Amino acid sequence: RSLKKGPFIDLHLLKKVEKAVESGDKKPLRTWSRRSTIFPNMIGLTIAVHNGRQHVPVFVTDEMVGHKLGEFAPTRTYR
Amino acid sequence: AKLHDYYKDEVVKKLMTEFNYNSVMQVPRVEKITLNMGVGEAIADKKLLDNAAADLAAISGQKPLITKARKSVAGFKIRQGYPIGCKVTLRGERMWEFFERLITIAVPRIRDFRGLSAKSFDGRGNYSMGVREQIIFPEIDYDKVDRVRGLDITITTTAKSDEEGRALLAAFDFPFRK
Amino acid sequence: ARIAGINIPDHKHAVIALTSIYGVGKTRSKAILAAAGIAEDVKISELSEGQIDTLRDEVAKFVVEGDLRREISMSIKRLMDLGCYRGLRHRRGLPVRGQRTKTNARTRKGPRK
RNA sequence: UCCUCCUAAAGAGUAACGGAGGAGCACGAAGGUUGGCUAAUCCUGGUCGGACAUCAGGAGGUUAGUGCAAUGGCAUAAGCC
RNA sequence: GGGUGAUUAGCUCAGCUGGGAGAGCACCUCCCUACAAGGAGGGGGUCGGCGGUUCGAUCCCGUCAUCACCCACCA
RNA sequence: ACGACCAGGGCUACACACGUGCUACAAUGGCGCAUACAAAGAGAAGCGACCUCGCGAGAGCAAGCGGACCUCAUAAAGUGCGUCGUAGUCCGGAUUGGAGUCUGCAACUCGACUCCAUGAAGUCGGAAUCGCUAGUAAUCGUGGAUCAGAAUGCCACGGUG
């Protein structure tokens, strides 16, 4: 909206997000960039976000909206 | 007292009829109403508080008294002759002279209703209320350097269920929960 | 006197007790002075009942008087989870907009000993 | 030294360098009398009231108040008014 | 066991015929020229514990706890 | 391999004391309203008028000029008439809320700008440290460079005393 209109999902994430719904018996998707955006209608999927030293598993709720992967859930404790 | 003929229709008459009753005695009545003001304030020098009782005497059917305490346990180092309130209760004749304007017609500044209604009622007029937030309206000698004064009301009724006696409140400026 | 201004200075300028009050500032104070068509220079017009208190409808499309905070005081309770950046920053006294804490934070941190 | 309770075995009498405490005054009002009335504490509702005084009710009813320790009584109220 | 005193800021100590928490050092921070001195600011108090009376006890009164000073006797 | 390639990250990550600045603390000032006196620069999907939409940031429609001419472009302090009754105030504005405008892979963290509400400090600064002998200490307004968006620092210029 206020940040030059509609958001964009980085192609390395857009190729693997509807393949996590629908994730099979295989491991949850690893992502290394906290800069990537998620869209508010996304729900019921587990993803693993890198923080610089660890990968943090997170389940996406109905209360999570259009966030960046640094805002949606606490990837570090951190202080 | 010039206004009391409304009691045959505007209050408790539909209640009386929806039980086929024939007397005003088969439905609730007001035993007493009390207009009590607080004097226990301790934030300024006690200088203008009898003229605040004169401001209450401009709407009460009886003028406030000096009053006395009953305990002397308090951290205010008081004697049991210490003035503790105002002693202002109405029965019968001058209570019909109170509802003559107050809580019935005295304020044209009505509010757009959001839900705020009479609360906590049980079986003996069990609702108590002070006034909240400022709008200002004309009062006697009110061009004075003193904070805006209101009224804190208490009432007792001949009831057993205040939810059933809800029609005793129908002639007033305030609403009841649906 | 005091027909719209809630304060005892009644012989003064048209901003006094008529700005920064119950959801009204300069811009919305002008909007009800405009609704009643009255005069404002040096003093506000001497006015009676049924002249401007009847026109509070013409400036009603804002959060005002008893409604100034009412519904937001429930809507702001919607996010409270400790994993939510907005939830945590509502549940504690923190800026949801984010600020710097190291240097030039002394209003938010308050006085230093 | 003066007073409350126990010491004390249910008569009466009663001991201990026996066991726990108060009193050294106070009030002309806290006395007299006729008439009236009903407290604490908790809870719900009145906050501009900063542990405790304070307005109305429900529960309760000398559990509050009775000048003092302690004992006991007080609605017939010795209570407060 | 006993008598007489003390108890309040880290230290040294006021406030003791009824509430108002304080002074000089010390510490931290700061000013000068290297270390102080000199001049300012600031932090922090079960005012030892339990009762008596009083609305209220750092205070008065009884009684504990911990430390100093003097004792603990006749055989 | 601490060389070099490749992708994400860090350089406003927080604790405490500042060195230099700045809006000020009110009336050598504000609030409202009208109003005088300028230089130096920038302008090839530029500078963009007049007008219009939007509360507004900004944007739409398109002249003028490729620029001693047009356009950026209503200098401010000052000057005139009202007002404030000296008080943390009609002062002052960190905050606080809901939504936008503009740019860039990127605005959580970590950007500039806006509308309507909403709200706390600040009372001339402790020892001391620094500037000028006159267009001198002090003070008001306009441009430019770097550059996608972003300076209150840098470089030019004019006003008052």
Curated annotation (Swiss-Prot), chain A:
Coiled coil: none annotated. It holds the Pfam family Ribosomal_S19. One of its GO terms (cellular component) is cytoplasm. GO terms for molecular function: rRNA binding; structural constituent of ribosome; tRNA binding. GO terms for biological process: cytoplasmic translation; ribosomal small subunit assembly. Transmembrane segments: none annotated. Keywords: Ribonucleoprotein, Ribosomal protein, RNA-binding, rRNA-binding, tRNA-binding. This is Small ribosomal subunit protein uS19.
Swiss-Prot record, chain B:
GO terms for cellular component: cytoplasm; cytosol; cytosolic large ribosomal subunit. PROSITE patterns: RIBOSOMAL_L5. GO terms for molecular function: 5S rRNA binding; RNA binding; structural constituent of ribosome; tRNA binding. GO terms for biological process: cytoplasmic translation; ribosomal large subunit assembly; translation. SUPFAM superfamilies: RL5-like (SSF55282). It holds the Pfam family Ribosomal_L5. Belongs to the universal ribosomal protein uL5 family. Identified as a multicopy suppressor of the slow growth phenotype of an rsgA (yjeQ) deletion mutant. This is one of the proteins that bind and probably mediate the attachment of the 5S RNA into the large ribosomal subunit, where it forms part of the central protuberance. Its 5S rRNA binding is significantly enhanced in the presence of L18. Part of the 50S ribosomal subunit; part of the 5S rRNA/L5/L18/L25 subcomplex. Contacts the 5S rRNA; cross-links to the P site tRNA. Forms a bridge to the 30S subunit in the 70S ribosome, contacting protein S13 and S19. This is Large ribosomal subunit protein uL5. It comes from Escherichia coli (strain K12).
From Swiss-Prot, chain C:
Coiled coil: none annotated. InterPro entries: Rbsml_uS13_C, Ribosomal_uS13, Ribosomal_uS13-like_H2TH, Ribosomal_uS13_bac-type, Ribosomal_uS13_CS. The keyword Disulfide bond does not apply. One of its GO terms (cellular component) is small ribosomal subunit. Residues 93-113 are annotated as: Disordered. It comes from the Bacteria. The keyword RNA-binding applies. Keywords: Ribonucleoprotein, Ribosomal protein, RNA-binding, rRNA-binding, tRNA-binding. GO terms for molecular function: rRNA binding; structural constituent of ribosome; tRNA binding. GO terms for biological process: cytoplasmic translation. NCBIfam families: uS13_bact (TIGR03631). Belongs to the universal ribosomal protein uS13 family. Part of the 30S ribosomal subunit. Forms a loose heterodimer with protein S19. Cross-links to the P site tRNA and weakly to the A site tRNA. Forms two bridges to the 50S subunit in the 70S ribosome, contacting the 16S rRNA and proteins S19 and L5. Located at the top of the head of the 30S subunit, it contacts several helices of the 16S rRNA. This is Small ribosomal subunit protein uS13. The gene is rpsM.
